[PDB]
Amino acid sequence: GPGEALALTEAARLFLRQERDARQRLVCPAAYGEPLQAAASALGAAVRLHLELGQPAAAAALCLELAAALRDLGQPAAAAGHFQRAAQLQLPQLPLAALQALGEAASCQLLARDYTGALAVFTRMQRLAREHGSHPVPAALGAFSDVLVRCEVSRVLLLLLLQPPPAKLLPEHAQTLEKYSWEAFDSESSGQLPEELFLLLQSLVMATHEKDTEAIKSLQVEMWPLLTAEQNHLLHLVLQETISPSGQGV
Amino acid sequence: XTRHWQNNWWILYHEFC
Amino acid sequence: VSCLEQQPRNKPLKALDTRFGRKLSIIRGIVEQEIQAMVSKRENIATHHLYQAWDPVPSLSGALISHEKLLLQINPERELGSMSYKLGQVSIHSVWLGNSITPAGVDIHSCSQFLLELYSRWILPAILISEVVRSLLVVSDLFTERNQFELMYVTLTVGALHGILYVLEQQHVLVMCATAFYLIENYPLDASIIQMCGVMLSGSEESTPSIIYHCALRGLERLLLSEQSPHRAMAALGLMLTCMYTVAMERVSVLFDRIRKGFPCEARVVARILPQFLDDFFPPQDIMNKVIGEFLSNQQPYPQFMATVVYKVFQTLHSTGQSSMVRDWVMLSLSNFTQRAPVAMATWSLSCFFVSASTSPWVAAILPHVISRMGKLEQVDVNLFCLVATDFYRHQIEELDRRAFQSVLEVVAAPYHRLLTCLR
Amino acid sequence: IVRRGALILFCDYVCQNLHDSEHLTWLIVNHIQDLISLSHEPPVQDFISAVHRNSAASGLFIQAIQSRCENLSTPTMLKKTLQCLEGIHLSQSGAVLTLYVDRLLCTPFRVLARMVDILACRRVEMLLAANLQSSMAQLPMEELNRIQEYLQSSGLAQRHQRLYSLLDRFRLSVSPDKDWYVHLVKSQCWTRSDSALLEGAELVNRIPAEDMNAFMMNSEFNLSLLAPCLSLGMSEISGGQKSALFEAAREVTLARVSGTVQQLPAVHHVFQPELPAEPAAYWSKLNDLFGDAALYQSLPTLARALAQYLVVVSKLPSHLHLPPEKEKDIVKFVVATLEALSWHLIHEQIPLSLDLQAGLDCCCLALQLPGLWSVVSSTEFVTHACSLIHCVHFILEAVAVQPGEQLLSPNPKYITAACEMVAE
């Protein structure tokens, strides 16, 4: 019967409370993850059970619980995988729930320093949010419009951090980066973004090409109140990589 | 007098300088 | 300040002491500093500074062993930069070695005499039994100098794998791979693993997790020594290099493609290693065509990284005594250099090329200033090219090639034009 | 709602009554900021389009913007100003171009500096297309010379060469050794430009070892290079070489860290954000120090160098350990940097992310070293330890805690406050 999934998720909540007691509440150095192996096994069984019952939206909820536990327990590279499993299980039936789960995957990739993985997930989000939430039946609906603003700002900062070469530089990236220039149009180009944030992102994409380091320092303090903490971290990484590059070893 | 370079869009190149 | 001691089950690799082991350690160590910076969990580093990796492995016969001496020595079932407790912290060989069994600042021996009595007095004469047996499993890592560790054995009522790994001396996949690599290295005499790990290392970015990828690859990379995404690519380069040092032009073409298709960080790493790889596997007459050709190619995103490679190759020739190629390949190539389309960029490529070719001190040293000004053509950018060309025109080149030099400059003068005011 | 609606309705009336002008001059002279702010409303857009069709009206509009440019400088308002100066009347071209160079271009908002450069270029092209009479009358000799002198005495002529060359188009109507290389590297490394620090470090590494100390200790040397110099020199030390660069950078870092600690008041009091300046003779000196931009930016720049030294000192040769005489001055400098960052939060805004990081890097590493720990854990540093606790708690809440929230949810008084702060 279906009540086996309730027994397995209540058992997993007990094991995850034991792991939270050991790793977060007591902060025991002697912990080695045996309660978490048990939690991942009971939620794995309940996920497969919900899938053979044809309840993929219920399986996705159990993927989100494990992903949240892994993130809270200091394993963000693992949590990103289960957040993407949840998004994949939700997407054909709940597109906005899938965008929530991809947003948590991208946050987990940024914690794991997996910047190219984060760039790909935000690009998938910006594609899906235009596909499912930006139609006349054109401007985005309010819930999807908030996802579009998140992706745009984050992708611009990730592209300024990573600076991909030709053919890694997708049409989706070239097209985003084209908007962050000006030439011939004054006598509304801000799109989904607040106009103050758009002018500072325009200025940042220009100051980074010019390597205008004192302009990037100026823009970083001006943008600080306007960004999320995750986005202020991304902007710090852009300024850091500009003053002292990676891959040089010295 | 700055432009984007043909072989890499993140490289600037110079015409009036 | 501190994390738990580790004493790995694996011993130092013998192959690293050889001629082809020392030069491997330099090149694979550059790739290691970068895999550590890109994917380490950094649990013992609070500060942002990228290249501060260390492992908690003390020397014994004391002071911590340097990370650059611990190449492939840390236990494969530990994810990179994870400093937390696991069932194999200290090897059976280290408790036999450090305490002479061979079958700090605190009285930890008395703490270990205690609990061996008190736990036995509860579990010998089930919740407490399970947590006390857990406590014995953990605290056995500080047992020294005794027959009384065999009190554990007499106190009778992942599975067995963190245990089989002692008897032979995602969590399931990690220890199961670690079991497989340790057998193949130490007990070879009493090929499917080497196949199926290659299958795991050729799944998608999602079907094989990053911590499963990096551990299995470092497992196979240890099996090759001893003669018995940007980060996923950087790890795969390590496996290629250890093979190259333990068809050669195919194995270099993939590196030049790594520079052309890679992110700037990934490309900058490959451009640091490429000079020594070329010297270790090719004669410089065969190098010189590819390295100039890939500085000039239109499928080259990173001229400023290539400008450091063709400096190592020219400075190697200019110091090994084959000083002919640092004129002959300059004169061969200066038609291609002068005729590239964007003028400030083409002039800047030649300023690098002549700086790299130079005779003297100082003009060999000025290269970071030239690499700084990439794409510019102000008064100082033309004036440097005039000076640097006048160094080459005096101290290198015979009148027939000196007329060839004049002829190729005249073919573009129609910043090149003001050379004709100082070449005469 | 009434303030804006009343102006919009009055613009609609003046636009229907353009046969007389007394109401048009009032609206411009008194409401220029509101006309610009509301320029997207149809009647105000039509009124802007009417001001574009009279020379005196466009002249009054430029004079009104010149008279409020210090409040139009915010990005949205500056964009709206430029949208209201595109299409302005042809006879006012020298006036609006004079506005564009005198008050704009200098803004850190690089998109608006490009917008105004393009509009400045479009106006010189209109002056080149017009007759010599009625173009030269809009900007004569001397006036054009003051524009070009300003563009060349600022950096603007080099940064906006299309404008500068259009103004010229209108106006017409051999290789020494060390003593050259040191001068060339001085040109890059004795100025406050952070654009090429790894290349600057490589260049100063090839100054010969005896001249490095004078080259670095000079007052014009870029302090941003000290952290790069320490980081580069550590690559030589970790290869088993002596590093003249690491040694020079170590002595200059410690000499500067010690030297700025002498500027501090002799007697130290706990930094408390809630209500400063009761002992006004102390706090007025801290305002004179921490408010001076030449002192304030020296601290996180030196803290970057100091943190780069303190993260390596555990794996250095014993010759390069912290001198025991410097251990008090390092603790004093670390405290003064956390205090300076806290003072910048109170009086200005968030410090620069790298500067917050530099101060917190030093604090973190100074508490990890057992010698520096022994200084700050001593009785005579009780007010310094209390400053560290107060500054860190203040920085944590100023970043993490919104107004109306708390950090947690479901024996002078400063010592007891320092206890409660560390416990939460």
Side-chain angles (χ1 to χ4, degrees):
Chain A
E4 174 169 325
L6 180 61
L8 288 165
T9 193
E10 293 281 21
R13 284 174 181 157
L14 285 161
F15 295 129
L16 292 175
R17 281 194 293 262
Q18 291 178 347
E19 193 67 1
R20 286 173 165 173
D21 267 320
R23 296 256 287 256
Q24 290 197 333
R25 187 57 267 261
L26 301 182
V27 192
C28 284
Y32 67 83
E34 186 166 341
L36 189 64
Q37 296 172 35
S41 301
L43 294 180
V47 162
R48 293 188 299 258
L49 179 60
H50 285 305
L51 291 174
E52 78 172 60
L53 268 50
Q55 302 172 341
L62 303 192
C63 296
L64 293 172
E65 186 145 18
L66 187 54
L70 282 163
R71 184 199 67 214
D72 296 353
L73 293 170
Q75 299 180 229
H82 300 104
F83 281 127
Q84 287 172 108
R85 194 179 294 183
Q88 195 73 4
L89 289 184
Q90 285 170 339
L91 182 60
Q93 297 195 141
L94 292 170
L96 196 283
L99 291 171
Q100 298 303 309
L102 289 189
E104 289 296 324
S107 294
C108 284
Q109 282 159 332
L110 295 176
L111 291 176
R113 309 191 311 291
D114 193 19
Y115 308 126
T116 56
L119 178 60
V121 170
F122 289 129
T123 304
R124 183 182 180 189
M125 292 166 70
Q126 191 156 336
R127 186 173 69 239
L128 289 175
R130 287 170 189 265
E131 179 170 5
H132 288 278
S134 206
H135 55 65
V137 186
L141 303 179
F144 293 92
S145 184
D146 295 345
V147 178
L148 290 170
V149 177
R150 182 184 176 184
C151 298
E152 181 82 341
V153 180
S154 309
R155 285 171 70 249
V156 169
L157 296 170
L158 279 160
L159 291 163
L160 292 190
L161 182 60
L162 292 165
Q163 305 189 13
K168 289 291 186 182
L169 205 171
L170 300 180
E172 291 296 318
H173 302 161
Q175 287 170 222
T176 288
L177 290 162
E178 187 74 356
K179 299 173 60 177
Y180 300 88
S181 68
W182 190 90
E183 187 68 13
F185 40 96
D186 256 341
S187 296
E188 299 191 318
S189 57
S190 197
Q192 303 295 150
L193 265 64
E195 188 170 10
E196 282 282 292
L197 184 54
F198 179 80
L199 294 177
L200 298 167
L201 283 164
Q202 277 262 24
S203 301
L204 179 71
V205 177
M206 292 173 66
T208 188
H209 278 96
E210 294 287 331
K211 216 178 185 185
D212 194 2
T213 302
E214 204 65 18
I216 303 163
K217 291 178 196 162
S218 304
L219 291 165
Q220 190 265 279
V221 298
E222 292 293 343
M223 292 171 73
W224 182 274
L226 302 177
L227 296 177
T228 74
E230 179 175 287
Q231 286 166 354
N232 277 320
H233 182 57
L234 282 172
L235 183 54
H236 163 76
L237 293 178
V238 175
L239 178 54
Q240 172 67 204
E241 193 68 20
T242 300
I243 288 165
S244 56
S246 64
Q248 189 62 31
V250 308
Chain B
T2 29
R3 301 294 185 178
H4 307 76
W5 186 53
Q6 298 180 349
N7 303 328
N8 181 353
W9 188 85
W10 263 287
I11 291 178
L12 299 183
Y13 154 72
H14 275 211
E15 349 293 275
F16 255 122
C17 282
Chain C
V1 172
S2 306
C3 51
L4 297 171
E5 168 173 14
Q6 287 173 43
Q7 289 296 344
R9 75 179 69 83
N10 293 325
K11 296 306 106 72
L13 291 167
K14 294 299 193 293
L16 300 181
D17 77 10
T18 67
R19 173 179 70 257
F20 302 144
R22 175 54 60 178
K23 300 199 84 182
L24 177 59
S25 300
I26 297 167
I27 202 165
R28 183 58 184 77
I30 289 164
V31 175
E32 189 61 17
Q33 285 180 0
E34 301 292 354
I35 296 162
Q36 291 300 327
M38 291 190 291
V39 308
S40 175
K41 202 139 79 81
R42 298 178 95 254
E43 295 197 329
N44 64 351
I45 319 172
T47 312
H48 73 287
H49 298 91
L50 276 70
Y51 319 107
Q52 306 304 339
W54 66 274
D55 301 280
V57 183
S59 59
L60 81 176
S61 300
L64 283 67
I65 303 175
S66 304
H67 178 75
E68 63 144 40
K69 305 304 204 300
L70 292 169
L71 295 178
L72 296 165
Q73 201 170 146
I74 282 63
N75 285 1
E77 76 286 357
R78 177 180 293 281
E79 69 197 271
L80 285 71
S82 180
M83 300 299 169
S84 60
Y85 192 78
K86 304 186 71 69
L87 295 309
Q89 278 301 126
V90 174
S91 72
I92 298 298
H93 178 261
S94 300
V95 293
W96 295 346
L97 175 65
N99 311 146
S100 307
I101 301 168
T102 311
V106 172
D107 191 344
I108 297 299
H109 191 289
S110 70
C111 297
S112 308
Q113 291 307 106
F114 205 90
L115 318 176
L116 270 178
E117 292 193 336
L118 181 59
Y119 296 165
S120 303
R121 201 174 70 86
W122 288 350
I123 76 175
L124 189 283
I127 178 166
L128 266 297
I129 302 173
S130 74
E131 289 296 324
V132 169
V133 167
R134 169 173 142 70
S135 184
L136 286 163
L137 200 182
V138 177
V139 180
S140 72
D141 295 337
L142 288 167
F143 293 172
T144 70
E145 299 288 341
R146 65 186 66 233
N147 295 344
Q148 295 179 347
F149 82 78
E150 303 188 337
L151 297 180
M152 298 179 73
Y153 274 13
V154 176
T155 310
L156 300 186
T157 294
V158 168
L161 292 168
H162 274 301
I164 294 160
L165 277 168
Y166 287 140
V167 170
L168 271 287
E169 215 196 304
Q170 289 178 15
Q171 212 64 223
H172 182 250
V173 181
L174 285 161
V175 71
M176 184 169 61
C177 293
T179 304
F181 307 131
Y182 197 68
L183 291 169
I184 294 163
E185 180 182 339
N186 298 277
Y187 305 101
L189 69 100
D190 58 344
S192 182
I193 300 299
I194 298 167
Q195 185 63 233
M196 75 195 295
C197 291
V199 178
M200 191 157 69
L201 300 173
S202 58
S204 76
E205 312 293 73
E206 285 300 318
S207 66
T208 299
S210 188
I211 73 97
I212 298 299
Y213 183 89
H214 289 292
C215 68
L217 190 151
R218 292 169 79 91
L220 294 180
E221 194 175 33
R222 190 179 171 83
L223 294 188
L224 188 279
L225 276 283
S226 78
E227 306 103 332
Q228 205 69 216
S229 299
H231 55 86
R232 294 196 183 206
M234 199 62 54
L237 173 64
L239 192 69
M240 191 218 75
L241 288 166
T242 59
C243 300
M244 201 84 184
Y245 282 88
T246 309
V247 66
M249 200 71 70
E250 195 274 342
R251 303 299 193 259
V252 84
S253 71
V254 64
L255 298 194
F256 291 110
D257 290 347
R258 215 64 240 161
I259 295 175
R260 101 178 79 255
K261 295 191 291 184
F263 291 90
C265 53
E266 176 194 4
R268 192 192 282 254
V269 175
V270 180
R272 288 199 298 129
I273 68 151
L274 187 65
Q276 193 212 302
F277 182 94
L278 291 164
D279 191 34
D280 288 336
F281 302 118
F282 302 90
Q285 297 86 346
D286 295 351
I287 296 172
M288 205 71 252
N289 185 41
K290 246 301 188 201
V291 300
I292 290 168
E294 297 289 17
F295 183 32
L296 266 53
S297 60
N298 287 319
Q299 300 296 344
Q300 180 53 258
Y302 310 110
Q304 76 285 15
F305 300 162
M306 287 302 308
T308 70
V309 180
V310 183
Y311 170 93
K312 298 308 181 303
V313 176
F314 280 177
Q315 194 63 215
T316 300
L317 283 165
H318 208 311
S319 58
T320 50
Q322 285 73 24
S323 63
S324 201
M325 277 80 84
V326 302
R327 183 246 278 126
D328 305 335
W329 277 95
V330 180
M331 298 311 267
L332 189 155
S333 310
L334 55 70
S335 56
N336 295 338
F337 274 87
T338 51
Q339 292 179 348
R340 295 216 303 160
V343 63
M345 207 75 181
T347 294
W348 172 84
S349 294
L350 277 171
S351 75
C352 296
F353 193 53
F354 288 168
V355 150
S356 306
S358 176
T359 44
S360 68
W362 321 109
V363 184
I366 198 166
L367 184 58
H369 186 72
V370 173
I371 282 175
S372 181
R373 303 195 113 251
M374 182 179 63
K376 302 189 176 186
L377 197 67
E378 299 175 324
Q379 291 183 344
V380 298
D381 304 316
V382 191
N383 289 354
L384 183 147
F385 176 52
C386 298
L387 188 71
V388 166
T390 302
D391 180 55
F392 178 79
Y393 184 81
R394 289 179 294 164
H395 288 60
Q396 287 149 256
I397 319 176
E398 60 128 290
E399 293 297 286
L400 295 307
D401 281 3
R402 192 164 280 99
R403 288 171 185 170
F405 193 86
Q406 290 273 5
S407 78
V408 176
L409 269 289
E410 190 264 17
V411 164
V412 296
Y416 302 114
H417 181 59
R418 70 162 286 119
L419 283 291
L420 308 179
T421 309
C422 68
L423 299 177
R424 298 186 295 168
Chain D
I1 298 169
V2 177
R3 198 185 80 86
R4 290 158 58 161
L7 196 93
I8 290 161
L9 293 176
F10 197 99
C11 288
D12 199 3
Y13 175 85
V14 176
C15 191
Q16 291 175 51
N17 287 43
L18 292 168
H19 62 273
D20 64 39
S21 66
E22 55 263 45
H23 298 301
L24 185 141
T25 178
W26 180 76
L27 213 61
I28 292 171
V29 169
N30 292 97
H31 282 294
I32 187 60
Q33 293 199 250
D34 303 307
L35 287 171
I36 292 166
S37 179
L38 301 169
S39 55
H40 59 282
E41 298 284 333
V44 190
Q45 189 177 8
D46 295 340
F47 177 93
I48 290 291
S49 307
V51 173
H52 291 353
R53 291 181 285 159
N54 177 283
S55 299
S58 286
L60 263 65
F61 199 83
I62 293 158
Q63 289 173 9
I65 290 162
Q66 177 78 256
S67 305
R68 291 299 293 157
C69 60
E70 75 289 347
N71 208 247
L72 294 169
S73 61
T74 290
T76 295
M77 292 298 173
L78 182 53
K79 192 172 59 73
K80 282 182 171 183
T81 305
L82 269 35
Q83 288 179 276
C84 296
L85 291 176
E86 188 174 58
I88 203 156
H89 195 272
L90 184 146
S91 66
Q92 308 313 117
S93 299
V96 78
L97 178 61
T98 300
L99 175 67
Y100 291 158
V101 299
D102 282 356
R103 297 301 190 174
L104 309 179
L105 300 166
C106 59
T107 52
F109 320 114
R110 290 292 83 199
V111 73
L112 287 156
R114 183 172 180 86
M115 288 166 168
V116 91
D117 169 34
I118 287 164
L119 291 163
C121 293
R122 282 162 74 199
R123 293 313 245 207
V124 188
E125 288 190 330
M126 292 171 69
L127 289 158
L128 288 167
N131 303 97
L132 297 175
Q133 71 279 13
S134 82
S135 66
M136 296 171 64
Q138 305 193 33
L139 66 103
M141 306 83 171
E142 305 193 327
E143 190 83 315
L144 179 58
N145 302 85
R146 293 305 184 190
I147 293 173
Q148 289 200 300
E149 178 176 50
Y150 162 81
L151 293 175
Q152 285 283 15
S153 55
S154 69
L156 293 175
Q158 289 71 27
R159 190 149 57 192
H160 298 128
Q161 285 180 312
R162 177 71 180 278
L163 182 62
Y164 190 84
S165 61
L166 283 170
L167 293 169
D168 280 348
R169 190 185 296 174
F170 187 85
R171 184 167 54 76
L172 67 93
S173 301
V174 67
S175 60
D177 302 328
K178 188 182 74 166
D179 61 350
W180 162 79
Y181 179 90
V182 172
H183 187 283
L184 182 129
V185 180
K186 172 165 63 173
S187 189
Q188 182 166 340
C189 291
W190 289 17
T191 184
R192 299 301 171 280
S193 66
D194 300 323
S195 60
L197 294 182
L198 305 191
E199 305 91 325
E202 286 268 36
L203 286 173
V204 73
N205 195 30
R206 251 294 283 124
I207 292 183
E210 63 267 33
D211 287 340
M212 288 195 193
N213 184 261
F215 186 93
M216 291 191 177
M217 199 66 186
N218 159 275
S219 43
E220 294 71 69
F221 179 80
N222 186 3
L223 295 181
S224 301
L225 290 168
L226 291 172
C229 291
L230 290 166
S231 184
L232 179 59
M234 185 69 226
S235 80
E236 306 181 326
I237 290 172
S238 58
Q241 300 171 217
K242 200 181 82 95
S243 184
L245 184 79
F246 194 90
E247 287 181 309
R250 201 196 81 130
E251 298 320 307
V252 174
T253 300
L254 292 178
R256 258 75 139 132
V257 160
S258 310
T260 192
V261 162
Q262 301 190 353
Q263 300 175 293
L264 306 174
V267 176
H268 178 274
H269 299 85
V270 183
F271 188 102
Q272 296 176 253
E274 308 305 324
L275 196 294
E278 290 192 326
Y282 178 74
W283 286 97
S284 57
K285 293 176 177 60
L286 296 191
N287 294 352
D288 291 350
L289 272 77
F290 297 167
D292 179 6
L295 189 151
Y296 175 71
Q297 283 289 286
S298 81
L299 292 178
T301 309
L302 291 176
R304 250 175 282 134
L306 181 63
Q308 183 60 76
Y309 177 35
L310 299 187
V311 77
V312 301
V313 77
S314 308
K315 60 175 169 183
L316 290 182
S318 59
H319 166 60
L320 301 172
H321 290 338
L322 279 161
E325 303 302 325
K326 296 287 185 285
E327 291 187 324
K328 296 193 182 186
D329 290 352
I330 273 63
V331 173
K332 287 179 177 182
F333 173 89
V334 169
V335 175
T337 304
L338 259 289
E339 290 177 351
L341 290 163
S342 300
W343 190 99
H344 197 252
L345 279 168
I346 293 164
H347 302 87
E348 283 81 67
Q349 67 274 123
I350 194 80
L352 191 295
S353 54
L354 284 63
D355 296 352
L356 250 171
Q357 193 185 246
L360 292 174
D361 293 332
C362 281
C363 188
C364 178
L365 296 166
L367 304 181
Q368 284 186 240
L369 289 161
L372 296 176
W373 173 259
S374 300
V375 174
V376 71
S377 64
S378 75
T379 313
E380 78 184 32
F381 281 79
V382 62
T383 70
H384 290 274
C386 286
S387 273
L388 294 182
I389 296 165
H390 286 81
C391 293
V392 169
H393 182 276
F394 179 64
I395 290 165
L396 171 61
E397 294 198 340
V399 171
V401 180
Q402 285 159 323
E405 305 307 325
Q406 297 84 19
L407 190 66
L408 305 175
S409 78
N411 180 21
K413 294 298 193 291
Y414 67 71
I415 290 190
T416 296
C419 295
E420 291 184 324
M421 287 181 183
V422 71
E424 71 184 355

